[PDB]
Amino acid sequence: LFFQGFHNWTLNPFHMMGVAGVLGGALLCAIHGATVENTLFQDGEGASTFRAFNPTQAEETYSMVTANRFWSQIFGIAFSNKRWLHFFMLFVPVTGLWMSAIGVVGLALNLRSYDFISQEIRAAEDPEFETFYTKNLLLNEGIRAWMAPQDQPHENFVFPEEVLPRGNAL
Amino acid sequence: METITYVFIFACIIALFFFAIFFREPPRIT
Amino acid sequence: ANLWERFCNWVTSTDNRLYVGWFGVIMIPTLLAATICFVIAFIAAPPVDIDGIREPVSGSLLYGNNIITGAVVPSSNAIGLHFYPIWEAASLDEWLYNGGPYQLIIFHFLLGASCYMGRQWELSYRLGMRPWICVAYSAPLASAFAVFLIYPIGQGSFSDGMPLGISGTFNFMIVFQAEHNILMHPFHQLGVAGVFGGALFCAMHGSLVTSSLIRETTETESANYGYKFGQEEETYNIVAAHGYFGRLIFQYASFNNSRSLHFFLAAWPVVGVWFTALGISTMAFNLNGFNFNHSVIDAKGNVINTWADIINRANLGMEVMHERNAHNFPLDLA
Amino acid sequence: MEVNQLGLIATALFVLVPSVFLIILYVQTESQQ
Amino acid sequence: MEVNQLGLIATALFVLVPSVFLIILYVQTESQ
Amino acid sequence: QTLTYDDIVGTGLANKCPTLDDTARGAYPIDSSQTYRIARLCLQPTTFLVKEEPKNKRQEAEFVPTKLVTRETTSLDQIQGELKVNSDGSLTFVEEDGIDFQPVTVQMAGGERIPLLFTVKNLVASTQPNVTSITTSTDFKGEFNVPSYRTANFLDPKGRGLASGYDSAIALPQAKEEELARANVKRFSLTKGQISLNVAKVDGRTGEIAGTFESEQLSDDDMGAHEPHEVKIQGVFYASIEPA
Amino acid sequence: ELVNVVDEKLGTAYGEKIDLNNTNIAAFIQYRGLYPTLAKLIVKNAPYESVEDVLNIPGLTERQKQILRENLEHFTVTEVETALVEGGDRYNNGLYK
Amino acid sequence: IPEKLAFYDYIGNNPAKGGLFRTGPMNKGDGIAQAWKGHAVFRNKEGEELFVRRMPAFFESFPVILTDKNGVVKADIPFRRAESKYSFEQQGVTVSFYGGELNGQTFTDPPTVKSYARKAIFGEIFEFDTETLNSDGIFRTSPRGWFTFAHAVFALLFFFGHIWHGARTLFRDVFSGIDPELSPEQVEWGFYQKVGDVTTRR
Amino acid sequence: AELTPEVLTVPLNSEGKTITLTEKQYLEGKRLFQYACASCHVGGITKTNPSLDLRTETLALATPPRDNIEGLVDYMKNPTTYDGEQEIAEVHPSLRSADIFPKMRNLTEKDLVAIAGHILVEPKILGDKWGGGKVYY
Amino acid sequence: NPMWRQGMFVLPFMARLGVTGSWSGWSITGETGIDPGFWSFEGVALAHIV
Amino acid sequence: METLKITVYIVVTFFVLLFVFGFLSGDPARNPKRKD
């Protein structure tokens, strides 16, 4: 929450690439697992399909071919290359985490993507102009004033009631 | 100009989709 | 040879480059309607009075937004959960001001996306596959239903459904935290575990297979040319990967059965994301995160703050600032 | 909007330079086989 | 100097686009 | 035989004023002695016209039609006030209370939204002298107050306001504040509007009357941010009269 | 020439006493005997030319006149500020706790 | 007080007040400094000296709070006006300047006093040319900031380079893949006493 | 810090007599206040009329004075407005209205004292939090 | 400030053959509150994209 | 608008009936192994 109010960290493109890396990692994890389990070859007679794998068999245990036709027809593209697929599974979440790391290095220096200058200039001049970008900074402003005194006690912040930012009624 | 730039890039991605699907390297067996 | 039967044959043909199917028959129109309206609205829709207070929020590029700040804005709180198709507006100008396009898009998308999941079953049946890939996609689909339909239903307004934009998304998740303490909710914590764990096991599995590729190539060519699409032999040594990973931890924390391993890969992020979709879906009925505010007091009764009280101070600043003009009475009950 | 003028040239080059690189390498790959 | 600031991008694309075209054709020539 | 809520709800008729039979061409006579009230005044607008800005000097811009975008939310109703007999026999209605405002926004050609506070607040409206009967030729003329569209707590999108909010452009901490004074310093406008009410139906039995109205007033100035537009509102009214 | 009228009114007696012509009605809780009854009346009968006009409010009992006299020194009158009286803001000005 | 010293005592030169995509020189933000205006001294109506609370670097925005030598809040710029007790208007806050361009001048009109107090949270008050560069008024970081950002980021990335090329050095024999005739007995447990040492079979 | 007798010592009446609660009475009163009163007065505020709180200074300026056990026990029997001018039993829980406010049915006379005691003790412990609202949470 | 002062090149070819109004309610003859149906400047442009 | 409403009701009914009757047209039999 600190990073939202103070750094507007969700606005940061390096965080956004991390988000895509983690979420795309989780997607890859799930879609690869489900595909294997649902293009299995029938290698045993039982309804539990786990028993019919042997860690030392030469043969692939699922059909890359049927997997590829399935996903080509459902999604338009599919993997055709098992090596590339498993490297891509390494590549996606690793890169995403590396990108987020870089953005936090920037925030070490308070070098944030806090603002869009063009938005602020227009909004300062035009009180009818409102976007989700300006709505979110009001919230950051709330966060800072309301949490700072208790979250940074060494600063001895005293904010009398009348200076706290607050909307109507709340 | 920024509007044109945003939509232009988006338009390129959609075109790329088209070629990636219908003009892919066709997977060939063994 | 009959007309209807030839049509049925084409609808269900395994030979179309993209499979249609009977689910496809609903999916394609509805996703075209939602896509086309989204693109036009994102570029050129005028501002929308999301909160019903005659304070329109500019969401589109031509009204001064960029890719990061733009959105299709949710429909008006004055409408609530009333259905607002085009033909219920006096004019398109009214429909635009009140946020019609959001409704059109989310209903067409949720339909087409439900049919997407069904289409996954269908083609699985036409190809002689096992059928449950669609069960894995139900996790993302349930998540989209939660933020676009369920949470609005419980709070009584599509104005509180998730905006279709990048900063609108962040606005939704900040307001959610102030109103539901979602961070302190166990189902969101399982979502994080499902999603962090998912990215972890993605990296793990990819690095283990990649570590055990069998030499088929030279140092001047991509290793990927060592696998040929449709080859019968497996392309890595699983016993070598088991042998490394079981020594990295201990033997019995490692999988030598590729079927169990890949089923594990499927179930962990799917179940975690079910729970987090269930989180949004039940916070929709205001069964909120754990509340430990002032839970620790001393012998006299002074409040002794914890980290939960600090979280509360931040939630308070979100609460009192959001929709700063929309509340006239002291409690924000929805 | 009062927007960074150089954003345009920056974006165009950001797109154009890496894309042309990729195309160059692809086309001379096809001229081999 | 109060120059046309679209001149930078016009000059740059004027050079880049046709030059890239030539380079592409030349390289694929040298590799066949 | 009147309707119920559940017959009306969702129809749009809740935003319509009651109508008088086209047979209703009588006259409500006035006893200089007795006193009278208006128990219900309903004003239902049908047309919103806005004055253009003609750029030159001697072309004087016209009123152009607008498109309503705020739906069936426009009517003033349950309005009540004193109805007095003046020394020279004119009547004067003095508004006391009622749902006597509605925010409205209409759209001009080209897209511009014009918000306005459609109101009759503090309305006083008089007749010609020597009435003695309200008839299908009786006219009321009067003026009312038009407060600021937003009241003093309203916060603009950067958090600035009159009775609450920031007093500067906090996103531009070392900007020169002189350019921004108009946007930074909010002002509560308070203007007057004019209305004519033309009686054209009268039920002599029940004291109900009804007719046409035209009012002229100013649109929203966004707390002094910009200059208002002039607005002309046409519609229909209904009122009911009681011996006080 | 662009002045915030509410801030300017904080520089008057309005900023130190209960202004019988402007102050929200919850201010009348700070002194005993005044809320809700007399405060209701004071507000509905505003505006006042002098602090002493409150006592000419029709219907005042003699006990009610005593309470007001007891508190005349805590009142003032300044010009009505439109921004503070519009919107029914003297009954509810959007401030709770 | 030399102007040079007073310019260091101003948060717009704090390298921790910038932003990633706020480009160019610091002069593009607050402008080209021209003169020290003077040191501002606030007093309430009782002649007490009041001290503006300075903005910490963490905060993009910061409220305006005035305190006495002892830390007690005695004035502020309120957000909600209706219950303000400490407004400049109520407290009779004045500002006086010693040194600089404004030396010896005192201001009492509230809007002006608030305005210098708004700047006094940034430390010492300066006059800027905002027009020459069309400065937008938003703080940017200094070369100290940019250099640190770039070298901390390059360093982190070069750690990956270290890991990549070190791996490639120590595993060159399997860069292209593992031995196609690795036997499960080398990889299975207990077979060798010492892992991978085929000379320690049982 | 602890729940000493000095903090548990609250005015009994306007005369100035005083009474020292036990820890038992205090916790008794806290429990009963949660049972019967906190749905509207959590933390010393009043959710359905935020202009009137349970701070000691507010109670003191109430007519009749309610900053004492006697005033508070009375209030729980026969509640009046803040100026004392009308009885509000019909809309405020009270023994006088336990028919419409059932939770008051089983409150005994000592229960009332424990509740009134809690109300007067809690500001001494929590300070401005008591009756101050979310600003002080 | 007619079209030919604003660098409009294709707007006059639409005007020439009868397209004169916009879905936003203005026409080039300066008449407001017009309903051009589909064949406004916007709809001609759309039809050429499709 | 009423013309738009009519048109959409029609288009929707059309697609929903394609769907209902499509699955009613012996869908279990359209697989590669055992047809019935």
Ligand SMILES: CCCCCCCCCCCCCCCCCC(=O)OC[C@H](CO[C@@H]1O[C@H](CO[C@H]2O[C@H](CO)[C@H](O)[C@H](O)[C@H]2O)[C@H](O)[C@H](O)[C@H]1O)OC(=O)CCCCCCCCCCCCCCCCC
């Ligand atoms: C890839 C594989 C898949 C294949 C793909 C197939 C390719 C086909 C792709 C379709 C392309 C669609 C393009 C989007 C169309 C939306 C246009 C729109 O909505 O355009 C609608 C236009 C726009 O209307 C105007 O819309 C305006 C909206 O204003 C807004 O927009 C203005 C212009 O930007 C300004 O910005 C203005 O400020 C702002 O307020 C005003 O309100 C005008 O009054 C209003 O007339 O209306 C008109 O007259 C139109 C006619 C409707 C008149 C009403 C009669 C109803 C007729 C029934 C319609 C049937 C539809 C066909 C279905 C039948 C199937 C057999």
Ligand code: CLA
């Ligand atoms: C869609 C939602 C979403 C998603 C997917 C992410 C995803 C991410 N966020 Mg973001 N975040 C979001 C929303 C989201 N965020 C929002 C709304 C905010 C508010 C602004 C933030 C605020 C936020 C902050 C403040 C930070 C992130 C960070 C991160 C990254 C965490 C990387 C990681 O795995 O750390 C996990 C931690 C590690 C990998 C470190 C090492 C872990 C070791 C191996 C632990 C070993 C444990 C040991 C064996 C024993 C433990 C046992 C014990 C438990 C019993 C990742 C890219 C972080 C980031 O970007 O970092 C660079 C960060 O600091 N986010």
Ligand code: CLA
């Ligand atoms: C490190 C911090 C962190 C991390 C890791 C997470 C992680 C997560 N959060 Mg939490 N969150 C955080 C911090 C964090 N959050 C903070 C600080 C806040 C408060 C400010 C929140 C507030 C919050 C909220 C309010 C919500 C989350 C949600 C989520 C989940 C988002 C992913 C998801 O829903 O996938 C699920 C998958 C999808 C949503 C994808 C649906 C895909 C559809 C079906 C298809 C789309 C097709 C597309 C349009 C076209 C593509 C085709 C292409 C050709 C174009 C995930 C578990 C969300 C959640 O639980 O939702 C259920 C949620 O609503 N979080």
Ligand code: CLA
């Ligand atoms: C160590 C490198 C370094 C540093 C610290 C500086 C520092 C500075 N330069 Mg100098 N400069 C450098 C290298 C450097 N320069 C080089 C190599 C060039 C030649 C191009 C220049 C040319 C140059 C000019 C022409 C100007 C400066 C100026 C400046 C000042 C402002 C910088 C600014 O706004 O940055 C802005 C920084 C950013 C916007 C960050 C950009 C990094 C992006 C966001 C990362 C890209 C992400 C990537 C695509 C992610 C994908 C990865 C994934 C796919 C794997 C500052 C003192 C300006 C000045 O004031 O001079 C008077 C000025 O006008 N510099």
Ligand code: CLA
């Ligand atoms: C994640 C961290 C990490 C990892 C996994 C590696 C891994 C590797 N390094 Mg690299 N290395 C690192 C960080 C790392 N290094 C750092 C930070 C430096 C210094 C900048 C180096 C410098 C370095 C050199 C110069 C060389 C390697 C080499 C190697 C390879 C052989 C193993 C080796 O020499 O280990 C090195 C072992 C360690 C880094 C662990 C040391 C543990 C230290 C001594 C403990 C310190 C305790 C300290 C006193 C606590 C008190 C401090 C407190 C006050 C803060 C391998 C690829 C070699 C190579 O590539 O061969 C081909 C080689 O020549 N490394």
Ligand SMILES: CC(C)=CCC/C(C)=C/CC/C(C)=C/CC/C(C)=C/CC/C(C)=C/CC/C(C)=C/CC/C(C)=C/CC/C(C)=C/CC/C(C)=C/CC1=CC(=O)C(C)=C(C)C1=O
């Ligand atoms: C009109 C206008 C202009 C519209 C605007 C709309 C709008 C707002 C657009 C905004 C766009 C926006 C800016 C998005 C930004 C996205 C973002 C943050 C960028 C990420 C950038 C970046 C490089 C991130 C670093 C991390 C990174 C590397 C992440 C990569 C994520 C990713 C691509 C993962 C793959 C996901 C995916 C769906 C793969 C499916 C693959 C697939 C076909 C598998 C199927 C499959 C499985 C099997 O198992 C087998 C066996 C077979 C055979 C098989 O096939």
Ligand SMILES: CCCCCCCCCCCCCCCC(=O)OC[C@H](COP(=O)(O)OC[C@@H](O)CO)OC(=O)CCCCCCCCCCCCCCC
């Ligand atoms: C009817 C419904 C159909 C849905 C239509 C959707 C089509 C779009 C899907 C992708 C087309 C482009 C993929 C190109 C790239 C391409 O053709 O890849 C094709 C590639 C083929 O892999 P193979 O294993 O064959 O390659 C082996 C070797 O050639 C590698 O050297 O597939 C992948 O690598 C899978 C992972 C890519 C995953 C990329 C998907 C992400 C796309 C979505 C991102 C969109 C952001 C847009 C924001 C505006």
Ligand code: HEC
């Ligand atoms: C809502 C349903 C309430 C419950 C339950 C209780 N109280 Fe209450 N209380 C409520 C209101 C709306 C008011 C204001 C009444 C008015 O118009 O004056 C009050 C007031 C009090 C007071 C007076 C406070 C003051 O400033 O003088 C007291 C002392 C009080 N209430 C006590 C009290 C107790 C002990 C309760 C439990 C038994 C209780 N209240 C319940 C609303 C509600």
Ligand SMILES: CC1=C(/C=C/C(C)=C/C=C/C(C)=C/C=C/C=C(C)/C=C/C=C(C)/C=C/C2=C(C)CCCC2(C)C)C(C)(C)CCC1
């Ligand atoms: C001229 C001009 C201009 C510019 C322009 C431009 C810049 C352009 C571009 C353009 C572009 C850039 C375009 C592109 C296009 C694209 C396309 C054409 C696409 C297509 C696609 C498709 C066809 C698809 C399909 C599909 C299917 C069918 C299925 C599913 C999948 C998919 C989706 C793939 C301006 C404005 C300045 C001005 C005026 C003039």
Ligand code: OEX
């Ligand atoms: O709208 Mn959207 O957000 Ca769910 O709560 Mn109430 O409402 Mn509004 O406030 Mn908080």
Ligand SMILES: [Cl-]
């Ligand atoms: Cl908000």
Ligand SMILES: [Cl-]
């Ligand atoms: Cl409310």
Ligand SMILES: [Fe+2]
């Ligand atoms: Fe795998």
